[PDB]
Paper text:
It is an integral, metal-dependent inner-membrane protein, with a large periplasmic domain containing the catalytic centre and the conserved Thr285 that is likely to act as the acceptor for the phosphoethanolamine group during the transfer reaction.
To understand MCR diversity, we have solved the crystal structure of the MCR-2 catalytic domain (residues 217–538; MCR-2CD), which is 87% identical to MCR-1CD. Although the Zn1 coordination distances are shorter in MCR-2 compared with MCR-1, there are no other structural differences around the Zn1 site, further underlying the importance of Zn1 to enzyme function. A single residue (Ser330) is a Ramachandran plot outlier, with φ and ψ values of −165.9 and −82.4°, respectively. The MCR-2CD structure also indicates that amino-acid mutations on the periplasmic facing surface of MCR-1 are well tolerated. The physiological relevance of the second zinc site has yet to be established, although it has now been observed in three MCR crystal structures. Resolving this issue will require accurate and detailed mechanistic and computational studies of phosphoethanolamine transfer by the MCR family of enzymes, the latter of which will be greatly facilitated by the exceptionally high resolution of the current structure.
Author numbering: 217 to 540
Amino acid sequence: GPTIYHAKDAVQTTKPSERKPRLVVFVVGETARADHVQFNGYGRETFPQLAKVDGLANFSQVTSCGTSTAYSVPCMFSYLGQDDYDVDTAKYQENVLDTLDRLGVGILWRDNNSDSKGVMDKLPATQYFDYKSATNNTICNTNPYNECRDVGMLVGLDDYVSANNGKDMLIMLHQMGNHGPAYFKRYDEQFAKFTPVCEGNELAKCEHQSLINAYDNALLATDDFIAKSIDWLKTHEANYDVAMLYVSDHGESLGENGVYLHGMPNAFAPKEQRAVPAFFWSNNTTFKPTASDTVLTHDAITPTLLKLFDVTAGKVKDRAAFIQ
Ligand SMILES: [Zn+2]
Ligand SMILES: [Zn+2]
């Protein structure tokens, strides 16, 4: 049958013709655990750069829709919520990006992870780019693995802003982040702060502290990427109200009870695979975060993205969001 719509009643209550246009980067994070962020109680400073950003909000009580990228990513952009979510048919539902595009918001998705897991499939091919290879990513030569880096997704974004100047814009950066098993490959060597590091692709053969250290070094690289994304947004704050939303797609098991990696069914998965960090920053009070300890899930993402662009829609109007 046809695409199943959920927000045909969506309306944008203020337009970029009547107020300052809005430019948002949504970092779609990867494999990051809430309990390895110092803001949430971790006894190591894994986010030192974000710790120094004025106006950076951290959300300490967020849990994911699921435990893998294929499962969680479509749910993050869904109208259905985790309880009604069906991974098999998510591709055939109107999602929040479809709504925003229909209402005139520019949508761009750069992917240094895998792909959009069906989220971008109805939208024009010109709105999605594979940043896992040097065909598009200019930052793949900073490490001996030739692995393309998340910071490469920021290069050239000014051309996109110029081509859509004066419109509202939402840019998804799907980062490699902390995906394993080979955490040691996920960061350039200026982030090799904690030692010893487990150097291999079979984590069950790692000594425990060396496994943690490799994982935490990868978090330092993500701290840096998010900080640089905020720096990029700041270069546009004269002409746009700017904001950055970060949410990880799921956590990671690090050997607790013999469990590694992620992907367990929600009915069985340990809390480590579900408790995820989330951050929000904006340049001014056009947006206001909700309380940092609000109990939230991935169901909060769709209403947040709508609120960022002053869009209302009946399907999610009583949902808690990351902003007021
Ligand atoms: Zn995975
Ligand atoms: Zn993932």
